[PDB]
Design a protein around this ligand. Structure first.
Ligand code: HEC
Ligand code: HEC
Ligand code: HEC
Ligand code: HEC
Ligand code: HEC
Ligand code: HEC
Ligand SMILES: *C(=O)CCCCCCCCC
Ligand code: SF4
Ligand code: F3S
Lengths: 162, 408, 190, 949
């Protein structure tokens, strides 16, 4: 009989479980118990460049001064930069406003400023969006290197309306 | 034999001598061989009926046993050779959780499922109905309370009455009428497993009547050997006479000549045709690695039925017993040769190969033979081997008493 | 029973965290995987305690506060001096949606290409305290939802050869299953 | 059954480069001392899978079959997981201290230190070795090759000034004269496949013809237009005869008149094609190689140049011999070697071992405890290419980098890291490489070099000079050794050397010429077989059996060999013998299969004089292909000649079958009682073979068995002709020396008395026939006979035009293997996954990482089939639909590895409704041709025509 706190019975599982290695499951042979072993340091795959500026207080303002956006005008006026701001950013920062968000109303954690207060260039978003400034985190795990620049053009349009 | 079946089902078809080229051999060979055997009884009880052949009355009952114990043997091969037989139920068009996933209705393998399952089903109720007045004559003996109960259950409430007999006769006439079409159509559907192919040596139009003629021929040859030993063991030689034996021999002779005509028909057409692939296929049978299968097959089928033209050979229980056995050997090769010689040689010379069976191919066949005899042998000690309702309607019409009375 | 008591109800239903935030690989890859423990820190560097108006009749505040600390043991965070240690252990989650590995389902061309809402395949996920499989996934639900839907041909330039055709010839729009060919034994399990 | 519990493990810390479900590609290179290539490594979330080719403006060295199968060496559980010292498990610190102290003692005593290696074409490795030598007063560096080519190197060095090989361009010549060349094989690291094939296509009324002179029979012979059986004592004389014609000279050549009748013709034609001809020869004699240089200079052909010399082979048979002698003669101290295996490859290894007994601190770097690792002091655990860093210069003007793709599985250490630690250099080899990268890379350091994989470096032609080639000609003509029966050693496409001793894909991979697998053998011509009473035979179960034989040499013998009577294999008086199978250390008895023969490589010469005797028993062979000849079936491989192609209408060389109507003839494809389906829109696919480019199609097989998870079957269960392969290469000989000679015997035939004797003689292939290859896979038919008879409806067709094969409704009633007239359909019989009857890479847990997760693994009773690349083309449509684009021109061709991995441009995959692809321009041709059009099955794969002359 079928219970709900345990999976149901099966009739001759010929090809149900895996012989190959589907990505996130557990195995026995590997270094850890995982199945997601880390790549070697210093290597470069096809279609990716490493970011050449180090962490904050010495590489922050060096990235703020001389670092530019490698996009074109066909890609900026597409609306895809707004959709990424609709997902990953309204939870702390405001959607049309700045700092109002969804979570300083509920008072879960405080200390989110506006965009009038801090002057930010188009290369100073990209250094914070990959590393975080003391209360953010690395959003490089979520967004890709083509897509952080699509967000940075949209944030500049939000400061100009303020 | 059962042990061998379990072994190969649980360990793999690769234990058989099958090849990547030759996917069929000995499995379907024995399937169609048993199917051919199981057409004899449905001819004797239906065709001879339709042609008012009085002499069939002493055979009909044992002839029925021959089909119900042989179609069953054939029914094992469609399952045993399967790669994943526990999923066989998918063959049926049953509503399911796969978005009502169905079967197609274009394959002769499916047509075969319908042909065999309905052939058996119909023949089972046919011969069973004929037992009602014979079980009645056993329940009325009731020598033990056990047997009393057994036959009172095996028989239905068959108190033989005017009306009951009237209807009984009509039912048997209808079913005989339906049975002859089944004899033909069922074996034809089996025949189309090869006739509908694209393989040279198989693609043809002669098979639908050809294989049927062969089925009649091999079926009667089998029946005749059992009647010969039966009339001595059971002491029923006063019912199975030399006239019954002679008539069996005559029919075999006739169908043998039909088969012979079909052999020369195929050879003529092959020559007449401009297709090199068809001609080569026949050359391969005449001369090649399986020449001995082909020529021993031809020797048996060509000459065995021709001895029956000589009265001194035809009217001999000794001679006809031997010949009747021989026929079954030749017919086994008939089925074997067609399947194997046409597959190990075909389009693209790089795919040419051989074929040799293993002990588990042989063993399964032996098992079906053994099972056949277990069933038939038990039958002979529990069932009324000669229909009483039938014989008692001819005792006054024919026999060595009443004829002598008529002559004086 | 998951090893942590994670709640899709407080996060996705009361805080209105957007659905693509934690599960981020739905747009690109075929496996919209479980979010790794780096997403469990950039929101939870500043959230140590939970609340006072969120504990229920079944669940207390001290049940939550002593279980959010288990997230700190998996990563290595220390509450006192606010710094990473060097001892990490991953969290063994229990996967509740499974298919046999002859099928080929891909979340990427099935959410981003066809604009399907994220509650019509896995249920109303924001109103669940613990996670529940909602649909049955057994081969007659994949076919049935393909019978009654439309491919999106307005925006894609891949369909300009097909959609500008047959509006002059046959018809205005086509269903997914019986028109584009999405009911063939080599497109789903090969 | 309850059904198991599945768990999933996300990261504690996820790296930026890794996205679950997204494959990554890395630019790496390979060079193992024998094989070499530029390639891409496809990786999963942490590990490498199937090898791709690197084509970023440096597509000069594609991977061969041996390289494609090399991934199994990474995931081989039989590797030295931990280094040993004095036979015991030890640390690397123990190894480091042992080596350093022995070097100190050697310095104090004034001993000998020798490093052994093999052709390390590496600017930075060589520099590091130089530094070692600079620090150590008495270090000698010496290079050891298994199969040597020092005679060629001496000829080039003494004329141009360096030890390097001429990289010939076979696409820049019209007449190819080959005397023992074998350039389509392993000759000088044969990578000339594309160059040759490019000149075999009749674009106009032109085509490069090939003259093959040889003792053995090889692929270049099969791909030749003319082939002359010739022994090595005749070849040397023939070479001088060529010389006397191209270069006006009078040298008294002694050569058979019938041989002169052909040699002279070829030489005069070669001479006539000034600047458009090429002389290539593989005679193991510096003087012969010098004459080749002289002739190619006289021809002044475009194919000959020293601007980019080949740096791949730089050994010496004189230096190695000196080394061996000194080990036994004098006192030799610490010897360190890496990738060197004299015991088993060295013919004089018995003396090598006695030399090892006289040396101290023997250090050997390897992957396995082989025969030399055994007789040593320190067994060092080396990384397997993808576990290491490096750089390779294949040619004179190039530089490339090698990236690791997987973090070290076992406890290994790089050879260069060891050298750095004994030299006293801080850091590691990677850091060393970084420091020395700016010396070559003038552009961006890593971002534009590691990312792409290669870097272009300029070069210049080498100066020539005066040399008495006339003297060399007279020396060669005077040279003569005419005795009795001789043999020639050779390498295989599946077995280059002993680096793949236990590789199941290369053990199973059948020989492209003889069509056998899992074993070694001896090649004897039928004219010799009749003298020695040797033979082979087809038995009742379908496989082959054959006699045994004994090879005797001066002061030695083999006592048990397995001969195969290849009719044209040997010219006359010669024997073929493959070298490289007899290994016994550190491997299972299922892999310990074959004969070594390296003991017969006396003085590094491939040609040896022998005595052949018949033995007692009979051997069984795992033979893949049965019949040797083609029965005159011109409807399979249509061939014609160039002048017919040029002057006659297609009706006379590419004729399609006709069917009679109302007393009228019509193309057979127009007769149809049924109605067709509309596949005019939405990506109708095809696939295109041209038979001229099919040289051997070797690496096309292994790449198709890489995604599709086809299991490995042993020697038995292939011996019964029950193997598992999705595509196959054929082999069709002839009777009476031509394919048109097997169409004159058949069309002239009588009634039933001669046709029982001609069809029995047309399966015995005559002496020196013509060879033809034909790749055969499942062409996805339209009126497919394999469809309609499946009772459980597991097969169907798509709108694109495939044959979709579901692995689910297939309840194995084995019909559809029968109605395929091409008969390419592989039912599986046992369970190949996890049982102990098949102890190959499918069984063990460490070796189930090659298997990609996108294709399922079959269990029992279900059939499988060479489908079109569905698991790639469903991703190419996917990656062109999210963006909002139309699929490009050559985007379908680059994804299906049946076509995107072959060397030449033979296989072409792609779209047809797109009228600008490569397939749509090939389908509209005068060579349009299907297999078996009279069957009426409408295939989707079309062959062209063999246009030989
Ligand atoms: C909650 C964890 C947040 C998320 C989600 C996003 N941001 Fe943020 N951001 C947050 C805080 C608390 C701060 C201030 C931290 C401090 O120490 O002052 C910020 C800061 C920024 C800034 C200004 C950086 C600067 O140097 O002045 C920018 C431009 C910014 N954040 C952008 C940004 C974007 C693009 C986001 C979506 C990926 C985003 N933030 C999310 C809190 C949080
Ligand atoms: C972070 C705050 C999340 C948000 C936003 C969403 N999900 Fe989630 N999800 C999250 C975790 C930590 C887990 C692990 C398993 C668990 O029970 O905690 C999940 C899991 C799921 C699953 C089931 C996974 C499986 O193996 O079957 C589903 C179906 C799922 N999540 C759906 C889902 C939807 C529809 C969301 C938008 C409303 C969503 N998730 C957001 C964490 C987070
Ligand atoms: C890993 C799982 C995560 C991630 C991705 C986020 N948080 Fe949470 N969070 C987490 C745990 C183990 C708990 C306690 C257990 C529970 O079911 O509640 C929480 C709880 C919260 C709370 C406190 C609830 C309250 O106020 O009473 C808040 C607030 C909260 N989570 C917010 C939050 C935000 C803004 C996140 C960024 C998207 C976030 N969480 C992610 C662990 C995890
Ligand atoms: C929001 C993001 C969505 C959307 C719209 C759908 N799913 Fe999918 N789903 C989602 C998550 C976070 C997971 C767990 C990931 C995992 O690998 O377990 C899933 C899981 C599935 C699965 C099981 C995975 C597998 O079998 O390989 C299936 C199947 C599945 N979901 C199907 C499915 C369908 C048909 C959807 C309709 C558009 C769909 N999902 C949407 C999150 C999300
Ligand atoms: C089982 C998993 C499902 C379920 C429950 C749904 N879909 Fe479908 N879907 C699925 C596969 C394997 C494919 C690929 C088929 C192909 O490539 O032709 C699809 C595809 C679609 C598409 C076409 C996408 C395109 O335009 O290229 C659409 C549109 C689509 N699916 C819609 C859809 C809807 C509305 C569903 C109900 C929630 C749905 N799918 C369920 C597999 C599966
Ligand atoms: C041809 C017949 C098809 C078609 C075109 C598809 N399916 Fe699939 N499928 C099929 C069978 C016989 C089975 C069951 C096999 C078994 O051993 O149970 C399946 C199975 C699935 C499943 C799993 C169902 C379960 O676990 O009970 C899923 C999910 C599934 N199929 C999905 C699927 C999709 C998305 C398809 C594209 C429309 C599809 N199937 C086509 C046979 C056939
Ligand atoms: C696992 O042990 C459960 C197996 C369930 C089998 C169901 C059989 C149904 C009746 C034939
Ligand atoms: S070639 Fe064989 S497998 Fe491919 S479609 Fe025709 S019959 Fe079926
Ligand atoms: S005909 Fe059908 S059941 Fe399998 S063996 Fe062939 S797909």
């Amino acid at each position: 009989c079928h219970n709900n706190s345990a999976p149901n019975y099966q009739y001759f599982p010929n090809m149900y479980e895996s012989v190959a290695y589907e990505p996130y499951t557990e195995a026995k042979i590997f270094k850890g118990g995982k199945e997601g072993q880390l790549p070697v340091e210093g290597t470069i795959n096809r279609g990716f460049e490493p970011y050449e500026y180090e962490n904050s207080t010495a590489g922050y303002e060096l990235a703020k001064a001389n670092l530019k956006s490698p996009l074109t005008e066909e890609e900026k006026n597409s609306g895809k930069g707004k959709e990424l701001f609709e997902i990953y950013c309204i939870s702390c920062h405001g959607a049309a406003g700045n700092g109002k968000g969804k979570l300083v109303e509920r008072e879960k954690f405080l200390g989110v400023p506006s965009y009038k207060d801090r002057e930010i260039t188009e290369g100073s978003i990209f250094h914070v969006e990959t590393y975080g400034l003391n209360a953010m985190g690395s959003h490089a795990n979520q967004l890709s290197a083509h897509e952080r620049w699509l967000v940075a053009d949209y944030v500049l349009k939000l400061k100009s309306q303020l | 034999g059962l042990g061998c079946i379990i072994y190969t089902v649980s360990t793999g078809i690769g234990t058989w001598g099958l090849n990547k080229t030759v996917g069929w051999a000995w499995d379907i060979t024995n399937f169609v061989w048993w199917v051919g055997i199981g057409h004899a009884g449905t001819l004797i009880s239906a065709v001879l009926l339709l042609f008012r052949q009085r002499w069939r009355m002493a055979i009909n009952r044992s002839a029925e046993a021959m089909t119900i114990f042989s179609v069953v043997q054939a029914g094992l091969f469609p399952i045993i050779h399967m790669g994943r037989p526990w999923l066989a139920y998918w063959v049926l068009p049953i509503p399911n959780q796969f978005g009502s996933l169905w079967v197609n209705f274009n394959s002769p393998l499916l047509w075969d499922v319908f042909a065999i399952s309905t052939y058996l089903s119909v023949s089972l109720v046919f011969w069973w109905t004929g037992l009602l007045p014979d079980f009645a004559m056993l329940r009325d003996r009731a020598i033990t309370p056990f047997n009393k109960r057994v036959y009172s259950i095996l028989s239905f409430g068959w108190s033989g009455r005017a009306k009951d007999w009237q209807r009984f006769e009509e039912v048997s006439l209808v079913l005989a009428g339906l049975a002859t079409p089944l004899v033909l159509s069922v074996h034809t559907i089996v025949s189309m497993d090869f006739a509908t192919s694209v393989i040279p040596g198989w693609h043809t139009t002669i098979f639908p009547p050809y294989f049927v003629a062969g089925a009649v021929f091999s079926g009667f040859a089998m029946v005749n050997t059992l009647l010969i030993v039966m009339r001595k063991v059971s002491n029923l030689e006063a019912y199975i006479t030399l006239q019954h034996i002679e008539l069996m021999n005559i029919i075999i002779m006739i169908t043998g000549s039909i088969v012979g005509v079909a052999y020369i028909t195929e050879l003529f057409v092959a020559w007449y045709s401009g297709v090199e692939y068809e001609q080569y296929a026949f050359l391969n049978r005449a001369t090649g690695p399986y020449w001995w299968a082909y020529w021993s097959m031809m020797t048996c089928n060509v000459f065995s039925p021709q001895f029956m033209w000589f009265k001194k050979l035809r009217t001999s229980i000794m001679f006809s017993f031997i010949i009747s056995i021989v026929v079954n050997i030749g017919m086994w090769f008939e089925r074997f040769v067609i399947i194997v010689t046409s597959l190990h040689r075909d389009y693209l010379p790089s795919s040419w190969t051989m074929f040799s069976p293993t002990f588990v191919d042989i063993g399964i066949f032996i098992g079906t033979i053994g099972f056949f005899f277990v069933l038939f042998l038990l039958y002979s000690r529990t069932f009324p081997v000669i229909a009483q309702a039938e014989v008692k309607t001819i005792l006054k019409g024919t026999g060595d008493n009443y004829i002598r009375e008529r002559a004086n | 029973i998951q090893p942590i008591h994670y709640s899709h109800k407080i996060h996705a239903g009361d805080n209105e965290i957007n659905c693509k935030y934690c599960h981020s690989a739905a747009r690109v890859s075929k496996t919209a995987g479980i979010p790794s423990l780096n997403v469990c820190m950039n929101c939870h560097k500043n959230i140590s305690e939970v609340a006072e108006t969120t504990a229920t009749a079944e669940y207390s505040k001290a049940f939550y506060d002593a279980q959010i600390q288990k997230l700190y043991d998996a990563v290595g965070w220390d509450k006192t001096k606010q710094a990473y240690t060097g001892k990490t252990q991953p969290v063994k989650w229990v996967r509740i949606h499974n298919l046999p590995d002859f099928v080929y389902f891909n979340h990427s061309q099935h959410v981003s290409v066809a604009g399907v809402e994220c509650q019509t395949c896995h249920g109303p996920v924001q109103e669940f305290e613990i996670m529940k499989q909602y649909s049955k996934l057994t081969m007659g639900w994949c076919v049935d939802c393909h019978r009654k839907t439309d491919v999106k041909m307005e925006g894609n330039a891949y369909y300009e050869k097909i959609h500008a055709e047959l509006s002059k010839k046959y018809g205005v729009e086509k269903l997914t299953a019986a028109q584009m060919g999405g009911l063939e034994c080599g497109k789903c399990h090969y | 059954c309850e059904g198991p519990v599945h768990k999933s493990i996300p990261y504690v810390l996820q790296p930026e480069q890794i996205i679950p479900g997204v494959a990554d590609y890395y630019a790496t290179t390979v060079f193992d001392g024998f094989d070499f290539a530029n390639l891409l490594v496809k990786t999963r979330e942490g590990r490498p899978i199937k090898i791709e080719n690197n084509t970023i403006a440096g597509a000069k060295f594609s991977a061969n079959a041996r390289i494609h199968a090399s991934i199994l060496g990474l995931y081989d559980s039989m590797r030295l997981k931990e280094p040993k010292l004095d036979g015991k498990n030890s640390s690397w610190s123990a190894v480091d201290l042992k080596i350093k102290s022995s070097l100190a003692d050697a310095k104090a005593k004034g001993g000998q230190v020798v490093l052994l290696t093999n052709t390390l074409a590496s600017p930075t490795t060589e520099k590091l070795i130089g530094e070692f030598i600079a620090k150590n007063p008495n270090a000698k560096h010496v290079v050891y090759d298994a199969v040597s080519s020092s005679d060629a190197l001496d000829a080039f060095e003494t004329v141009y000034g360096e030890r390097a090989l001429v990289d010939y361009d076979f696409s820049k010549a019209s007449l190819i004269v080959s005397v023992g060349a074998d350039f389509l094989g392993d000759w000088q690291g044969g990578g000339y496949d594309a160059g040759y094939a490019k000149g075999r296509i009749p674009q106009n009324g032109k085509m490069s013809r090939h003259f093959q002179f040889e003792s053995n029979m090889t692929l270049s012979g099969a791909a030749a237009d003319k082939r002359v059986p010739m022994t090595t004592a005749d070849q040397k004389q023939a070479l001088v005869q060529i010389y006397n014609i191209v270069v006006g000279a009078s040298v008294p050549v002694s050569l058979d008149a019938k041989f002169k009748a052909e040699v002279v013709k070829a030489a005069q034609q070669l001479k006539a094609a000034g600047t458009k001809g090429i002389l290539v020869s593989g005679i193991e004699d510096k003087n012969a190689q010098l004459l080749v240089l002289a002739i190619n200079q006289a021809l002044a052909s475009e194919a000959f140049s020293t601007a980019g010399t080949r740096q791949i082979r730089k050994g010496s048979n004189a230096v190695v011999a000196q080394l061996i002698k000194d080990m036994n003669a004098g006192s030799v101290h610490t010897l360190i070697m890496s990738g060197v295996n004299p015991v088993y490859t060295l013919a004089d290894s018995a003396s090598f071992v006695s030399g090892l007994k006289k040396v101290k601190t023997s250090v050997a770097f390897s992957l396995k405890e082989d025969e030399t690792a055994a007789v040593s002091t320190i067994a060092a655990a080396a990384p397997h290419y993808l576990e290491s860093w490096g750089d390779v210069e294949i040619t004179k003007g190039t530089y490339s980098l090698t990236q690791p793709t997987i973090r070290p599985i076992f406890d290994t250490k790089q050879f260069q890291d060891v050298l750095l630690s004994v030299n006293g250099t801080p850091g590691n080899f990677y850091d060393y490489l970084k420091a020395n990268s700016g010396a070559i890379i003038a552009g961006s350091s890593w971002n534009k070099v590691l990312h792409d994989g290669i870097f272009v470096v300029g070069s210049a032609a080498l100066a020539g000079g005066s040399y008495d080639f006339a003297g060399a000609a007279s020396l060669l003509s005077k040279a003569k050794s005419s005795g009795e029966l001789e043999l020639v050693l050779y390498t295989k496409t599946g077995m280059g050397d002993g680096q793949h001793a236990n590789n199941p894909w290369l053990q199973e991979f059948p020989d492209p010429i003889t069509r056998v697998s899992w074993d070694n053998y001896v090649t004897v011509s039928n004219a010799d077989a009749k003298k020695f009473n040797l033979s082979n035979e087809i038995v009742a179960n379908g496989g082959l059996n054959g006699s045994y034989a004994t090879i005797t040499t001066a002061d030695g013998n083999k006592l048990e060999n397995v001969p195969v009577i290849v009719q044209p294999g040997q010219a006359v008086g010669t024997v073929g013998l493959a070298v490289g199978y007899g290994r016994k250390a550190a491997l299972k008895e299922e892999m310990q299969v074959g004969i070594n023969a390296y003991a017969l490589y006396k003085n590094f010469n491939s040609v040896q004089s022998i005595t052949l005797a018949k033995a007692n028993g009979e051997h069984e062979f795992a033979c893949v292909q049965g019949q040797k000849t083609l029965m005159g079936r011109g409807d399979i491989i249509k061939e014609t000649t160039l002048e017919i192609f040029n002057t006659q209408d297609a009706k006379h060389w590419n004729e399609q079958p006709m069917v009679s109507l109302d007393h009228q003839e019509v193309e057979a494809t127009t007769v149809d009682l049924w109605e067709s389906f509309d596949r005019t829109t939405g990506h109708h696919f095809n696939l295109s073979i041209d038979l001229n480019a099919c040289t051997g199609c070797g690496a096309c097989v292994i790449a198709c068995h890489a995604e599709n998870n086809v299991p490995v079957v042993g020697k038995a269960e292939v011996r019964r002709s029950r193997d598992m392969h999705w595509l196959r290469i054929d082999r069709y000989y002839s009777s009476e020396s031509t394919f048109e000679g097997d169409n004159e015997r058949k069309e002239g035939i009588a009634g039933l008395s001669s046709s029982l004797s001609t069809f029995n003689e047309m399966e015995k292939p005559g002496d020196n026939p013509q060879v033809a290859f034909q790749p055969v896979m499942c062409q996805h038919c339209n009126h497919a006979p394999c469809e309609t008879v499946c009772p459980v409806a597991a097969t169907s067709h798509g709108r694109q035009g495939q044959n979709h094969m579901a692995y689910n409704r297939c309840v194995g009633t084995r019909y559809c293997a029968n109605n395929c007239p091409y008969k390419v359909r592989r039912f599986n019989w046992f369970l190949y996954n996890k049982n102990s009857e098949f102890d190959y890479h499918m069984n063990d847990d460490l070796g189930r990482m090659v298997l990609n997760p996108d294709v399922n693994v079959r269990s029992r009773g279900v059939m499988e089939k060479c489908s079109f690349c569905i698991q790639s083309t469903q991703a190419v449509i996917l990656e062109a639909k999210r963006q909002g684009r139309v699929v490009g021109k050559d985007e379908f061709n680059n994804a299906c590895a049946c076509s995107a991995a072959c060397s030449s441009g033979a296989m072409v995959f792609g779209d047809v409704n797109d009228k600008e692809s490569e397939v749509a321009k090939l389908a509209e041709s005068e060579r349009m041709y299907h297999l078996l059009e009279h069957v009426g099955t409408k295939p989707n794969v079309f062959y062209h025509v063999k246009v030989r002359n």
